[PDB]
Amino acid sequence: GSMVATVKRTIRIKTQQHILPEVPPVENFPVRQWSIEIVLLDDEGKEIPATIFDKVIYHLHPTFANPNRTFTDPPFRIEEQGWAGFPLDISVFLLEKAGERKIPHDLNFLQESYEVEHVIQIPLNKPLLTEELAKSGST
């Protein structure tokens, strides 16, 4: 029904992490610096700036201070320090108030860096968003 009037896009969440040796381990667990960024993929699979979002909010574990962190410019890079991975929620806000999407992400220390792809459905009823969507594929 109402979901017919949408296009799909794949976004790629990019995570990196490494130990900070100058930070005392917590219960023998080392503290790590970690970062998350978000890019968009085009129809050929190349990364391009995710300009279809005007805001990203990382909803961090409540062991973090001010755990809801807003970013407004691609690639919406967040950097933090911690000791244990966790599911976090990433809210991405489409241009022109076209809608919030909540992307589940798993922050973990299994790899130095790892990328995860998510498909979102985006409406075609906001002119400025529709023009932006043309940069990443058919509309």
Partner: peptide, 6 residues
């Protein structure tokens, strides 16, 4: 590398 929060 498998450290995780509750």
């Amino acid at each position: 590398q498998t450290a995780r929060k509750s």
